[PDB]
Design a protein around this nucleic acid. Structure first.
Ligand SMILES: Nc1ccn([C@H]2C[C@H](O)[C@@H](COP(=O)(O)NP(=O)(O)OP(=O)(O)O)O2)c(=O)n1
Ligand SMILES: [Mg+2]
Ligand SMILES: [Mg+2]
Length: 342
DNA sequence: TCTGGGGTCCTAGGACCC
DNA sequence: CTAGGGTCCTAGGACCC
């Protein structure tokens, strides 16, 4: 039969949090990101800032050119994590089939429920209302027979709204639905599709799957599927974090290896703590290092390793710095571990 | 404007053992 | 009648939040 998926997405998450915890903001253009001297980027802006065209992933200086009297906050992640924990707890009250995607997003599966007589509409409605009650903070939601359509639905009545797609409304919805709205279809893909001539799902509904498979491979057949309205993916409930990293971007490029080693030594204790929380004994399936150069090119050097240790990371780093650097300076130094299957 | 810090999933391409 | 060609790694892209 038809499944019942709800996707929930907080509104302007970080900015919403700083707004609630300080309404002295609330009406000024603010953004969470790094400082311009520290070569930072906008993590998120509120609507008064977006008004000036300030977006997430935008370099901070650019956001400042668009909004000089922007109020930039560094971030308070433990609070965001508190809110995430909270809304997840709320999600549980209605179902066990919950797949978190981030601090502020999740998929919920509710096709087997008595909570609103089967009304995904009313359960979503509730969830949002109690998020506003308990957390004093808004939320938007989408409802659909499949994941990606619930994702797309949760945007369509944003902010503090919800939207519901029924199996009856799907082909109508799909005929004029732009490809760039489907998750996983970013600007590169959305360009290749333009050259190919594809803009709506309805355009893909009438092409040749052999072609998409030849020019896109996987996440090419997916497009054909989603355009036909198929997404047989399921809420995972026990999806676990496969990797953990810690990386730092410096205010000035470094050109001395001593600087690099020093930075690795400042970063490792932080890779320690975070690892000592999924595996307090220090797992490792693989470990590795990351260098970003002045020309904004990066390289990662990882390998199979038994257990987390600094010496191997510094060896690998001294080697990555002597073999891939090419006289360049480095803006970013990073540490990284992959984790085991169980 | 001069571009973060976390992560996900795919793929090419090399290297090694058979 | 000095394997080649298949596996399994690593590096990197694209995308997500
Ligand atoms: N590039 C990005 C995008 C998201 N994030 C963080 C900041 C956001 O508050 C949070 C939520 O992701 P998001 O839903 O895409 N953005 P946000 O909730 O602020 O906007 P809306 O969902 O209301 O449109 O992730 C980030 O740090 N870097
Ligand atoms: Mg989001
Ligand atoms: Mg959001």
């Amino acid at each position: 039969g038809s499944r019942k998926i709800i996707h929930v997405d907080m509104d302007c998450f970080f900015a919403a949090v700083e707004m609630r915890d300080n309404p002295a903001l609330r009406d000024i253009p603010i953004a969470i990101g790094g400082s311009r001297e520290r070569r930072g980027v906008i993590s998120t802006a509120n609507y008064p800032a977006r008004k000036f065209g300030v977006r997430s992933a935008m370099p901070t200086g650019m956001a400042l050119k668009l909004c000089p009297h922007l109020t930039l906050l560094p971030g308070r992640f433990d609070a965001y994590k508190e809110a995430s924990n909270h809304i997840r707890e709320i999600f549980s009250r209605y179902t066990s089939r919950i797949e978190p995607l981030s601090l502020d997003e999740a998929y919920l599966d509710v096709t087997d429920s008595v909570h609103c007589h089967g009304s995904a509409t009313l359960i979503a409605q509730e969830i949002r209302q109690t998020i506003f009650n308990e957390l004093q903070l808004t939320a938007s939601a989408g409802v659909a027979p499949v994941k990606f359509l619930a994702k797309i639905a949760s945007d369509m009545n944003k902010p503090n709204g919800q939207f519901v797609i029924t199996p009856a409304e799907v082909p109508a919805f799909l005929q004029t639905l732009p490809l760039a709205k489907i998750p996983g279809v970013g600007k590169v893909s959305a360009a290749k599709l333009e050259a190919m001539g594809l803009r709506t799902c309805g355009d893909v509904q009438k092409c040749d799957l052999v072609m998409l498979l030849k020019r896109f491979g996987k996440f090419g057949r997916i497009l054909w599927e989603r355009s036909q309205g198929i997404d047989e993916r399921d809420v995972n409930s026990e999806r676990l974090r496969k990797s953990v990293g810690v990386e730092r971007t410096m205010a000035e490029d470094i050109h001395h290896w001593s600087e690099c080693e020093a930075i690795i030594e400042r970063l490792y204790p932080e890779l320690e703590r975070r690892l000592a929380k999924v595996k307090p004994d220090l797992l490792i399936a693989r470990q590795g290092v990351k260098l970003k150069f002045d020309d904004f090119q990066q390289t990662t050097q990882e390998h199979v390793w038994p257990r987390l240790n600094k010496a191997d990371l510094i060896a690998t780093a001294r080697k990555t710095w002597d073999e891939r650097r090419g006289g360049r300076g480095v803006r970013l130094v990073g540490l990284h571990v992959t984790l085991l299957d169980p």
